Design an enzyme around this catalytic site. Sequence first.
Site, PDB file in Angstrom:
ATOM      1  N   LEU G  36       0.828  -1.196   0.000  1.00 10.09           N
ATOM      2  CA  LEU G  36       0.000   0.000   0.000  1.00 10.09           C
ATOM      3  C   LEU G  36       0.867   1.253   0.000  1.00 10.09           C
ATOM      4  CD1 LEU G  36      -2.906  -0.862   2.472  1.00 10.09           C
ATOM      5  CD2 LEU G  36      -2.974  -0.795  -0.021  1.00 10.09           C
ATOM      6  N   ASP G  37       0.230   2.380  -0.290  1.00  9.57           N
ATOM      7  CA  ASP G  37       0.907   3.667  -0.335  1.00  9.57           C
ATOM      8  C   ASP G  37       0.786   4.403   0.994  1.00  9.57           C
ATOM      9  OD1 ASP G  37       2.475   5.543  -1.565  1.00  9.57           O
ATOM     10  OD2 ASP G  37       1.122   5.869  -3.260  1.00  9.57           O
ATOM     11  N   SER G  38       1.550   5.478   1.146  1.00 10.13           N
ATOM     12  CA  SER G  38       1.494   6.292   2.347  1.00 10.13           C
ATOM     13  C   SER G  38       0.084   6.810   2.566  1.00 10.13           C
ATOM     14  CB  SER G  38       2.441   7.481   2.253  1.00 10.13           C
ATOM     15  OG  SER G  38       3.742   7.019   2.075  1.00 10.13           O
ATOM     16  N   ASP G  40      -2.582   5.559   1.252  1.00 14.57           N
ATOM     17  CA  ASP G  40      -3.437   4.411   1.535  1.00 14.57           C
ATOM     18  C   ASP G  40      -3.500   4.139   3.030  1.00 14.57           C
ATOM     19  OD1 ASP G  40      -4.203   3.932  -1.069  1.00 14.57           O
ATOM     20  OD2 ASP G  40      -2.561   2.534  -1.467  1.00 14.57           O
ATOM     21  N   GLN G  41      -2.361   4.222   3.716  1.00 16.14           N
ATOM     22  CA  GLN G  41      -2.367   4.043   5.162  1.00 16.14           C
ATOM     23  C   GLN G  41      -3.190   5.125   5.844  1.00 16.14           C
ATOM     24  OE1 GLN G  41      -0.801   5.946   7.691  1.00 16.14           O
ATOM     25  NE2 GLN G  41      -0.596   4.494   9.385  1.00 16.14           N
TER      26      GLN G  41
END
Lengths: 94, 154, 112, 176, 114, 206, 76
Positions: G36-38, G40-41
């Site tokens: 996941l992406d930053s 996304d977190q």
Amino acid sequence: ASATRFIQWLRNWASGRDLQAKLQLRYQEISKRTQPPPKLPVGPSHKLSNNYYCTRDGRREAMPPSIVMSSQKKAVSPAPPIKRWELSQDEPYL
Amino acid sequence: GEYVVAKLDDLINWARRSSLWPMTFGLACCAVEMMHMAAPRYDMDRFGVVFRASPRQSDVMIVAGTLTNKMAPALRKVYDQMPEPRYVVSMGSCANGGGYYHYSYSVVRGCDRIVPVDIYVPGCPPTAEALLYGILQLQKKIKREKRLRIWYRR
Amino acid sequence: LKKTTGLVGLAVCETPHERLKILYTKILDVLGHIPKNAAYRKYTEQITNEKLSMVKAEPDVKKLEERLQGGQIEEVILQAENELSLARKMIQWKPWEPLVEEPPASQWKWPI
Amino acid sequence: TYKYVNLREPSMDMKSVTDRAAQTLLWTELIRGLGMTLSYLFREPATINYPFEKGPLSPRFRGEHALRRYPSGEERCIACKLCEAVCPAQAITIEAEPRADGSRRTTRYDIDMTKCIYCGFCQEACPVDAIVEGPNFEFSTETHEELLYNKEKLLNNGDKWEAEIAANIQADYLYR
Amino acid sequence: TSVKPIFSRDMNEAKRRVRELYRAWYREVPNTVHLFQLDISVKQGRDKVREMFKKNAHITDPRVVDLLVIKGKMELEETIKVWKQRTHVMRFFHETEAPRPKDFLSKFYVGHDP
Amino acid sequence: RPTVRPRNDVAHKQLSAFGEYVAEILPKYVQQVQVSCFNELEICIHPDGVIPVLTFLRDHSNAQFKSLADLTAVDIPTRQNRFEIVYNLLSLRFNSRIRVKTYTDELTPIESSVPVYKAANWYEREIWDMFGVFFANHPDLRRILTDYGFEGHPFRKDFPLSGYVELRYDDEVKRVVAEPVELAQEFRKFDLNSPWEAFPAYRQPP
Amino acid sequence: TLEGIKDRVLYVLKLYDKIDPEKLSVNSHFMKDLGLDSLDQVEIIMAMEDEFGFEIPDIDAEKLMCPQEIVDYIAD
Ligand SMILES: CCCCCCCCCCCCCCCCCC(=O)OC[C@H](COP(=O)(O)OCCN)OC(=O)CCCCCCCCCCCCCCCCC
Ligand code: SF4
Ligand code: SF4
Ligand code: SF4
């Protein structure tokens, strides 16, 4: 200027002024719409001698600013304090 | 049939052009000459053109001045709220096609990019008399309408 | 005692002489916390002392206003409050210190 | 020098207080205002009967543009482009070439009347009185395109209005 | 290389403000779609928010990141306070712009531009 | 001489003396002081000195520059710090004007002068809007003149005159839309400068 | 409630689209594992603040990198 004397009296009384002396419509007192031709004067540089441009060249007398301090005794103000205004003698109070 | 449709058209045209209620968008300096057209010398009211009408009671929008990009959406919204039949008069160089500010980043190059325009009044500003000529030109445009004749022939 | 200063919001001062003596004295005290060779201290003490001497030497308010040339005596009081407020800010700013940084070479060159 | 617009003390004697009471209760100053508007009702109005009557103008009036001729019929414009250079709105577009007889003349002369600010700089700049702002101000149109004048339109304006344009220039050229 | 900061003294400090701005934008889209009566879905609006953030992912100067956050917050304030109108919100989506050609051959056929 | 603007040496001397006066009192900040040939005094300062210098000129008894006439910026791309911030002040007490100038680049904030002059509020918003200079500790910094969502700072010398986008009403989406600018007639660039020097007095050394 | 808190945490994650249910584990890293992406977190945490009805500051949120760590944080 075409109002009957009765109507002139009526509107003068209602307004409290002599309106006929200062009508807001213009009649014959205005200047003619055809005028005689003008003959305009010439300026001071219109001379045949003693008129060299270098003696009347304002733009070339401009100078770059005078640098009084660069980062390369009494106190003073930027100018003398302003003088108090005087009350009008024509009509001091409305 | 033809005679009734023609006479009825003349009647509705006469009523609409004899009672033109303007909504004036006084955007800039052209709005001053519009005020002078309402002023005593020209007295637009004497033609049936009331001084200031509400947008929902209006029949003609007068765009009197520069239309900026920031203002363009609001002008379109007022136009869309107008009840029909509705006409637009573009007044002065700015509203006609951008004028002195034609090349500006912030100016719409003519109000006819935003709304359809019925009459273009030239000048920067047009004189109050020039604007009045334009309003009377709009009256003549309305006199030429044949809505009922075209309806009858559908 | 005048009835109005003529400036909206500037109330008349009942006791202008005492108010000015208090303010000018306060200013000379704050100035004492500035280094002796700072030009702000030398110049401000000079003008403040001149005004204070005028106040003591003239009991008539209208004649004092003429001497000071600061407008209404209520304006002169307000200016004293401004100078006192400024003097306290200069102590934290310390503008008598050397130039913080010279500009780039052509920063003030015009035309380019 | 200055004066006070509003610095006066009302007289607090009984007569003056009662005068102000009468004004408050009998609306005297409001009635005095009714007299002014009544006197205007009976004044002749300032309205003129347009289009049968027209507002006065002067020979200097800056209206619709026109391109002028010499008395022989030759165009005055010699495509110097001074008007195009001075135009504050860049409303003028000019192209030129040698004419078939060698004359220096324009092949394009356009004025975007919706860019133009009707300032008169073009007619000041012109050295041969070729481009002028004429006296006409009643030329509103139904479409934007009709206000984009090309050379044929401007020459037609000059031929249409030259009788008035020449007389107006005759009246004002000694001020220029 | 010694400069005055705007808000953040390093990228870690700046990246915090970016995340706070992203959350603010993320939570505002549903109300924006409702208040402005937009025809886009909430997912489209958030997909647009993410796209706007992602094109700036290569920045490593904290002062530049600070200005982007400063400008992003002004844009959010314009939206939440309905200073923007519907036209201003939908300008992010370029609905009337036809798709420009991206590959070499397509660009070659239509004009001279690179 | 009828056509030449007369000099005023008395005012030139007074302004020069006050310029040295200011430079002596705030050496920490004053970098340059100059008086023009038409007698306008300019103080050039390090940007850190904005609040101290403006406060001094507003409050000091020999200055009393109580009115901020104008606040603006100038874009000069050839400079490392391209933006020149100009404060024009007026002193009613001494019937005098002074100009204070500092500098900044695209990424360096300038301290907001709203604490000194409430008038600075909108002037600083205008500078931010038109030039992109960020003022620190402004009560409400945001665009003031440009359209909502407008990108860029139009008064920068490298921002094109007609901008990048233009507006029209689109019937399909039933709203005003923004699209890349296309001009039916391109603005015609003129090269007007004469190749002959006009003013020897301002010749720059080679 | 440690089971109660933990079950909800997984319920939200499966609802989140960019996570494969089969890949999902209570020990998977959002980045190193789930890919996941930053941002996304950040979206995941905002979903956590919704399910459990409380605010999670960015300083704490940047450490919650696996479903288990979220359980640990919510315990307090
Ligand atoms: C011996 C025993 C006797 C016993 C009986 C004695 C009684 C008689 C003596 C007393 C006289 C009473 C007069 C009553 C009239 C009402 C007076 C009144 O109310 O005026 C006051 C009102 C407010 O006044 P204001 O200046 O704003 O402030 C005062 C309070 N702060 O000001 C106003 O109301 C202003 C009105 C505003 C409206 C303006 C438009 C009207 C102007 C034109 C009016 C024309 C007159 C109307 C005639 C009607 C004809 C049918
Ligand atoms: S057309 Fe001329 S008068 Fe009218 S708004 Fe534009 S600049 Fe002003
Ligand atoms: S009147 Fe002014 S704006 Fe119009 S064409 Fe002439 S110079 Fe250009
Ligand atoms: S109209 Fe006059 S100024 Fe313009 S190009 Fe022709 S000659 Fe030159």
